[PDB]
Amino acid sequence: DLIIKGISVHI
Amino acid sequence: DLIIKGISVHI
Amino acid sequence: DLIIKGISVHI
Amino acid sequence: DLIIKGISVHI
Amino acid sequence: DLIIKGISVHI
Amino acid sequence: DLIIKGISVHI
Amino acid sequence: DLIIKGISVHI
Amino acid sequence: DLIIKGISVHI
Amino acid sequence: DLIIKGISVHI
Amino acid sequence: DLIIKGISVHI
Amino acid sequence: DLIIKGISVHI
Amino acid sequence: DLIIKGISVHI
Amino acid sequence: DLIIKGISVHI
Amino acid sequence: DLIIKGISVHI
Amino acid sequence: DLIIKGISVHI
Amino acid sequence: DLIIKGISVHI
Amino acid sequence: DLIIKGISVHI
Amino acid sequence: DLIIKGISVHI
Amino acid sequence: DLIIKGISVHI
Amino acid sequence: DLIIKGISVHI
């Protein structure tokens, strides 16, 4: 069981 | 069980 | 069980 | 069990 | 069990 | 059990 | 059990 | 059990 | 059990 | 059990 | 050519 | 050519 | 060519 | 060519 | 060519 | 060629 | 060629 | 060629 | 060629 | 060639 969470804030 | 969390703030 | 957490702040 | 935490602040 | 923590501040 | 902690401040 | 701690301040 | 601590200040 | 501590200040 | 401590100040 | 692979790739 | 693959690819 | 691989690659 | 590999690669 | 490998590589 | 390897490589 | 290896390499 | 090895190498 | 080895090498 | 070895080498 693997979890992948990205967050990208690029102005 | 592996967890991958990225965060990228690039102006 | 391995955990990978990156954080990148690049202006 | 291994833990990898990077932090990169590059202006 | 091994722990790897980097921190890089490069202006 | 081994621990690796780097810190790099390069202007 | 071994511990490795570097610190590098290079202007 | 061995401990390795470096410190480098190079202007 | 052995301990290794370096310090280097080089302008 | 042995201890190794260097100090180097080189301008 | 240029090649990236991974389970999680964050560009 | 240019190639990315992954289970999660975030551009 | 240029090649990166990894379980987590963060560019 | 240029090659990086790793379980976690942070560029 | 140029080659880096590691369990954690931080460029 | 140029080669670095390690369990933790911090450039 | 140029070769560095280590359990922890800090450039 | 030039070769460094170690358990902890600090350049 | 030039060769350094050690358990802790501090350049 | 030039060769240094040691348990702790401080250049």
Secondary structure of chain O as H, E, C letters: CEEECCCEEEC
Q: How many residue pairs bridge chain G and chain Q with CB atoms within 8 Å of each other?
A: 5
State the Cα–Cα distance between residues G4 and P4, nearest whole angstrom: 18
Q: Which method, experimentally, gave rise to this model?
A: cryo-EM
Collapsed DSSP state (helix, strand, coil) of residue E5: strand
Alpha helices by DSSP H, chain P: none
Q: Which residues of T touch S4 (CB under 8 A)?
A: 3-5, 9, 11
Total number of residues shown for chain M: 11
Q: What is the experimental resolution, given in Å to one decimal place?
A: 3.8
Count CB atoms within 10 A of the CB of residue Q6: 24
Q: Which residues of L touch K1 (CB under 8 A)?
A: 1-3
Q: Identify whether the C-beta of residue I8 lies closer than 8 Å to the C-beta of residue G8.
A: no
Q: How far is F9 from chain E (nearest CA, A)?
A: 5
Cα-to-chain-centroid distance, residue E8: 7
Contact check, Cβ <8 Å, P8/F6: yes
Q: How many residue pairs bridge chain I and chain T with CB atoms within 8 Å of each other?
A: 6
Contacts of S8 (CB under 8 A, 6+ apart): H4, H6, I4, I6, R6, R7, R8, R9, R10, T7, T8, T9
What tokens does A4 get?
């992948």
State the Cα–Cα distance between residues S9 and H4, nearest whole angstrom: 10
Contact check, Cβ <8 Å, N4/M3: yes
Give how far Cα R4 sits from Cα of C8, H6, R1, T9, Å: 30, 17, 10, 11
Tell me which chain O residue has its CA closest to the CA of residue P1.
O1
Q: Identify whether the C-beta of residue T11 lies closer than 8 Å to the C-beta of residue J8.
A: no
Contact check, Cβ <8 Å, E8/P7: no
Contact check, Cβ <8 Å, I6/T7: no
